[PDB]
Each structure stands twice: as structure tokens, then as C-alpha cells.
Design a protein around this ligand. Structure first.
Ligand SMILES: *[C@@H]1O[C@H](CO)[C@@H](O)[C@H](O)[C@H]1NC(C)=O
Lengths: 48, 48
């Protein structure tokens, strides 16, 4: 309108909080391949 | 991380139903009235 534009400017405000979880680690899984594949069985450990 | 061990069994548990009769399987197999393949006979042995 002439040289001027209509703008909504804030007249009041507050502070808002926002949470953000970022994963940086995970459970350190470890496998005993021999115990998993063959358990206690000697005949399996031989073939493995 | 060394290979997985298992605790050694310290005793043996053996269970069987006592005082069951003999199955007599030989008496039935040695019976001289032998059937042909056409009329092959069956016997079922349990609790013996
Ligand atoms: C701003 O907003 C808060 C919450 O609605 C209110 O308590 C406060 O009086 C307001 N201030 C003005 C200048 O409007």
C-alpha cells in the first residue's frame, strides 16, 4: 500500500522447551560362536 | 574372552518304572504258526 507492507509482528512471547534424544551408543553384543553353534557337545565341536 | 565352559555334572539321575514284566518278544517271534505276507501279524509291546 504505497511503499508499505502488512506484517504480523509479535506483541508478546514465552520461552518453550523441546526435548531431543540422540543415540550415541548401543548394547555391546558379544557372541561365543563355538558355544552358540555347538553347546556342550564334543561331536559338534569336532565337525565345527 | 576365552571359550565358554559349562559346570561339570556332580551326579547322575536315572529313573525307570520298577517291577515291569518282561516283553516276551522272543516267544511271539519263535511261535511256529508263522503268517504269510498277505496276512502279516502285528503285536504291540508297552509297559514291559
Ligand atoms: C503476555 O502473556 C502472558 C501469558 O498470556 C500474560 O501473563 C502477560 O500479561 C502478557 N503481557 C502482555 C504485555 O501482553
Amino acid at each position: 500500500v504505497g511503499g508499505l507492507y502488512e506484517i504480523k509482528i509479535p506483541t508478546n512471547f514465552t520461552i518453550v522447551g523441546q526435548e531431543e534424544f540422540i543415540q550415541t551408543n548401543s548394547p555391546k553384543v558379544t557372541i561365543d560362536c563355538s558355544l552358540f553353534v555347538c553347546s556342550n557337545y564334543a561331536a559338534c565341536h569336532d565337525l565345527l | 574372552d576365552l571359550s565358554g565352559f559349562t559346570v561339570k555334572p556332580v551326579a547322575t539321575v536315572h529313573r525307570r518304572i520298577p517291577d515291569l514284566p518282561d516283553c516276551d518278544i522272543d516267544k511271539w517271534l519263535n511261535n511256529f504258526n508263522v503268517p504269510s505276507p498277505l496276512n502279516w501279524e502285528r503285536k504291540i509291546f508297552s509297559n514291559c
